[PDB]
Every structure is written in C-alpha cells, then in structure tokens.
Design a protein around this ligand. Structure first.
Ligand code: AMP
Ligand code: AMP
Lengths: 372, 372
C-alpha cells in the first residue's frame, strides 16, 4: 500500500548499467502515475507510491522486462508498535479467501532490541485480536506476513507477484529486427527484447503490388510490441524498384534468393546507420514455409553481422503459443537449393549498389508507443 | 503385437527424402532386432515385428526424431471373425488398470460388407464374452479399441505412444556444431538434430594446458548425443600452437577475441571439407558467462556462414531443463567491448594462415555410436 519493492532478475559497472536501464524503463511505464518516487539501489528497487493506486501500478509493472518479482510493502518506523500496525495493514490489503496466516521475520538490523523468537507471538497476537474468523498455520498458511527489520524503517509484505523476467530492455545493446506480417517475426522481436536487447524494426514493402492492409499489419505488430519496451522504431523500406530490377536482371529461379540477399544488404546498411550490432529474423529450420539450409547459406553470404535467429530450432506450436501469449497472433493471422556460385554469377550482371543506397536513403521511420 | 505403425511428424520429392531418411534412422536403431521388416509409404511406416519383442522395439523407437506417434497393431485378414479376434488380442496386450473399453471404427475399405453401425456391437460383444469384470464406456473408456478396415487386411490397436517428434535426422542437411564442456553446447547440438539437421561436432582443445579429463567430457557429451541419431562424428582440433602464438602476437585485452575468431575461421574451413552449410554454437544472450553483443559482433566478422544459435534467447533454466532431460547435464557439470577495427589491426601484425591450415590438417576424427 505504501511501497512496491522490485527484486531484480540476475546480473560493478554491469549492475549500474542494469539498474539505471531498469529505472528508466519502469519510470517510462509508470509516468502516468506522477506522484511515485523511485529509488533503485544495486540490490533492490523501491517504488514509493505516495497515494497512487498500487493495483494500477502493479498491472503495468508486470510487463516490464528485468523484474523477477515484486512486493506491495508497508514502510513503517522500526519499533514493535509501528511494526505491529504495518503488519495488520499489509494483511488487510489481501483480497481473496483469507482464513489463515503465518509470520516470518528477517532481521537485517542486528541491534534491534527484541529477538525474532519474541517478535513472532507479538505480531501474530496483534493481527489475531484485530480480525474476526482467522487463525495461524505454520504449515499451510493463506497469507504469509513477512517482516524485514532494518534500522529506522522496516518493511512488511504479504503480496508477492511474479514479474516478466528477462533483462531490462536496452542493457544488452541494439539490433535491427526484420519484421514481416507472419506469425514468426514479431515473436522473434519479443524474445530479443526479453534478453535485454532493444530492437528497431525493419520492414520491406513494395507499395504498388503489396497492399496497404499488409503494411498496416506490420504497423499493428510493431504497435503491439510497445507493451514490452519504451518505444518501437519502425523503418519502412520501399522495395518496389529493387523488386522490379530483380525481375528484369535476374533469372527467375534465383529472383527470391537475390531479393532476400538485397534485403540483408540494405538491412546491414541501416544497422550501421543506427549503431545496431546485429540483425534479428524469425527464420526457423524445417517448417513447410521455412527456408532450407541451402537457402539460408546462400543468403547469409552477403553479411558477416550476427544474425540472431530466436526461433531457429523452435516448432510451429511453441511459436504460436508465444504469439498468442504476447497478443500478436491474431494480427499476424490477417490474410494478406540455391548455390552461392550462381547467386554471385547472376548478380554480377547488374550493379545493385545505387538501388541499395537509395532504398536506405528512402526508408521512412515511425516511432510507436503504448497509447495508455 | 504383430505390427508397429508409425505416424510421421509433418512434411513430392520432399516426402521421399523424409520417408527414406526416417526409414534408414529407424532401421539403424532397430538393427539388433533383425527379424523386423519395415515398409515406409508416403503416409505411414509399417514395422512388421515377426515375433520381436514389441516393448523392446517401442523403447528404442521413442527416441527417433521424425516420429509423431506410433501404435502397436494387429494385422488381421478382413472379415468380421478375424477382426473380432484381432480386437481381443490387441485389447489383452494392455497392461495397467483395465476395467472399461470403447470401440471406434474407421472404414477406409468402402466395399466392406457390414456397416460401422453393425460392427460396433459385434466387436464389443466378442471382447465382452471373453473377459471377466469388464464393461463398455462411450464417455470415459480405459482402453480405446480402434479398428482400421482396409481391403484384404485390417489393423486393430489400443496402445498409442508418443514419439520424439521433430524431423528425421539428416533430412535438413548437415552443420558443424562447436562442442565444449559446458551445459550449453550439447543442448544446442540436440536442438539442431531435432529439426532434422545432422551435426558433426568440432572441439578445440589445447593438450598441454587443458586436461585429458576435459577432453573426456566432450567425448562423453558426444557419446551421449548418439542416443538421438545414427552416429556422432567428433573432430578434435589441436589448438595449443594457435593459442601460444596469440599470447605472443596479440595484445592481451584481445587475445580471447582473436582466439574465438581463429576458432571460427578453422571451423569454417572444416565445414567446407565436410560439406556442412552452417555452424551451430551454444551461445546465448545476456547470461553472466555469455558474451556481449559487441563480442559476438566482432567474432562473427570472419565468417558469413550461417551461425545457428538455438539458445540465443533462452534463459539458463530452460537450457538446464533440457540438458537434464537429454542427460548431458551431469556430464557438463564435471568441474574442469571488442571492436572490429582493433581486432583487425592486431591480427594484421602476424599471418595466422599457416596456423589455421595446419590446425585443419591436424584435426582428429572419432565416430561415436550408441553401444547397445
Ligand atoms: N517484407 C519483409 N520485411 C522485413 N522482413 C521480412 C520480410 N519478409 C521476411 N522478412 C524476414 O525474414 C524472415 C524469414 O522470411 P520467410 O522465410 O520469407 O518467412 C521473417 O521472419 C522476417 O524476419
Ligand atoms: N573449446 C571449444 N571447442 C569447441 N567449441 C567451443 C569451445 N569453447 C566454446 N565453444 C563454443 O562457443 C560457444 C560459446 O563460447 P563461450 O561463450 O566461451 O561459452 C559454446 O557454446 C561452444 O559452442
């Protein structure tokens, strides 16, 4: 009711970069709760509520990567009486079938006048004589009342919620994610972010002979991903001229291979511009619509940038499960052996460099946020 | 008791390559059951048992990638009487608390004299008057007795077992997997195989100042992986001289970066020799012992071969879970920001090409099998 105490996932200078990234991301997520103050130490993040609805704050906190668990806590002055009080207040904030309880005491303030042995019956007694049909269970308690005793101030909590886990978005760096309208790529973007890497999305569209409705899918997908980070930058690359030239200059059996090669070349040029160190795709091995190893081998020739492939060894079912969980599935669902020698030999016949450079120069950038 | 009918995972020329790969892998797995005959059509694989212990065959069948499910079946001639018989025999082969049953009839042979409507009470009646304390349930049956009626011969089955899933090892091609003694790399090798890609393992060891016990770990890990494919080819590359030269020629802050770059260069040279189209690693993002994106970005400079990274966005817990499931965990457990400009500038100072070529020439190859 007074505080939310967030416990970090897992991590010197590495912790600083972790904490301050988490701070900024949490701050941004809760900015529509302007009364809150946040102190983030190297071991714990303290969210001072100052009247702000703890439930409302909780519902937004659970979507932030980098948080293992968090607790709704009471911060009370550190003598027995103020401790007794805070325990009760914390206890009463627990909705649901509440019939039994337990008290647990961590004593970090070693010079506290009373012993844990003695504190137990005291706090229990105070909750007992201030409730109605409620007893204690040491073995099967409904509500665990945990008392952390520190000097000056002490925390009481009963309400432990799971966080999203993973790593604060931004701590690991930045990659470009190749986003398309299928089920896969948004999932891959999501998994990248969960490991603390922020993503900028890159989408190739060919405005005449691809529809606006298909472009809206990608925008909608990028919009949905805003739930998991501060903002999603979406680069829309006009691909139509490159697509046309490939049809004219390249033998048909290789047109798709070269187009994907051209996609990767352009994406690398964007990655450099944006100081991104890798490129994410939703490629996976061995599905009907998934490319062969031969295809992958031939397309990857054009870049020695890491190509992060989160779904590389995942099956359709686990991919769909996640897409459903994160809520990109129903948007995605809207219904709209190559060799290196030959790929090179065909590309030798026309200089795609001006096309590549213009496509980079012509990209449009949207910046999406969760619109509260 | 007479047959095992395997149902395929999921997949023209693509099915042929799938079926015959599965056939060869199953054949190899069951070669110590020499009486068995295997017919594999494009829709089903039939294993004629010919007296061979079906349980023993089942226990080895469940570890073969490419099998969704399989059934212990009876193949009986296709008139009512031989059908009644086979149903009972199939039913009686079911160990466990058997008290109720049900009959289900798929009628693929359209010109079969009797209708499903009539077949139901007949087969049920025959099992009823030939068992003791057993009735039928249409809603909550212990044993489902499924009758597939075809011309000439018909199948009865009650015993549906799950298979390993994934894709027949070999169907997708071949990659080199970089294998080390940690928890990760064997898991990555395993996940690669489950998507139907066979792996050849590559391990760098530096015989004087790495132990034989550490090399035995990798051998043990490769041995354990033989459970999931026909054989594991393990390449042991002597790395000591390259390691020494790096210590002498390279500034210390970059020695590890260059060593890994040298590893990747050698591995690519081996991949080519072995007609492998990619390289698998157990790299993941954002664990304490995992490399940074900067590190990954700088090491990947030296190869434009696909680098398959199955665990790239997995956490420690899911990695450990799998390593435990596949039984590599307890072997692994045995206790034994770089920039491209600087990496290149330092490597410019000494020609590592002769070292790279000799290491490739000096690799030793072991071939491991599951030793029944
Ligand atoms: N039009 C596109 N724009 C951006 N990325 C794409 C596009 N098409 C495909 N991709 C990326 O390439 C991956 C594999 O392509 P595919 O095998 O054609 O589904 C997808 O998961 C996307 O990450
Ligand atoms: N000595 C080695 N031999 C072969 N592969 C290795 C070796 N050391 C590391 N690797 C590979 O590189 C990956 C990441 O290395 P690391 O970040 O050092 O654990 C491991 O998962 C292995 O696939």
């Amino acid at each position: 009711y007074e505080y939310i105490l967030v416990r970090y996932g897992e991590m010197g200078k590495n912790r600083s970069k972790f904490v301050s990234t988490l701070k900024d991301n949490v701050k941004f997520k809760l900015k529509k709760f302007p009364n809150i103050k946040i102190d983030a130490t190297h071991d714990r993040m303290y969210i001072q509520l100052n009247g702000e609805d703890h439930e409302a704050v909780s519902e937004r906190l659970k979507d932030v990567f980098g948080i293992h668990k968090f607790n709704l806590a009471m911060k009370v002055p550190s003598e027995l009486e103020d401790i007794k009080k805070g325990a009760l207040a914390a206890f009463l904030q627990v909705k649901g079938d509440v019939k039994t309880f337990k008290i647990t005491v961590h004593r970090s303030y070693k010079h506290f006048p009373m012993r844990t042995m003695e504190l137990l019956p005291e706090i229990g007694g105070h909750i007992l004589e201030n409730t109605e049909d409620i007893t204690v269970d040491v073995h099967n308690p409904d509500v665990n009342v945990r008392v952390e005793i520190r000097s000056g101030y002490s925390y009481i909590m009963c309400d432990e919620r799971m966080g999203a886990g993973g790593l604060p978005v931004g701590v690991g760096g930045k990659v470009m994610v190749l986003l398309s309208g299928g089920i896969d790529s948004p999932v891959a973007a999501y998994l990248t972010m969960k490991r603390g890497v922020s993503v900028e999305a890159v989408h190739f569209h060919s405005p005449p002979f691809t529809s606006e409705r298909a472009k809206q899918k990608v925008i909608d997908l990028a919009q949905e991903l805003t739930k998991y980070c501060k903002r999603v930058t979406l680069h829309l690359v006009p691909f139509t001229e490159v697509q046309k030239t490939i049809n004219k200059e390249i033998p048909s059996s290789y047109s798709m291979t070269v187009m994907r090669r051209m996609m990767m070349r352009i994406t690398e040029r964007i990655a450099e511009e944006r100081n991104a160190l890798a490129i994410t795709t939703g490629e996976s091995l061995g599905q009907v619509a998934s490319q062969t190893l031969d295809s992958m081998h031939t397309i990857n020739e054009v870049t020695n940038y890491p190509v992060i492939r989160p779904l590389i060894t995942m099956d359709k079912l686990e991919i769909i499960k996640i897409a459903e969980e994160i809520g990109t599935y129903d948007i995605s669902i809207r219904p709209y052996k190559p060799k290196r020698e030959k790929a090179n030999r065909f590309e030798a016949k026309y200089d795609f460099t001006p096309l590549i450079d213009e496509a980079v120069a012509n990209k449009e950038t949207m910046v999406l946020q969760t619109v509260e």
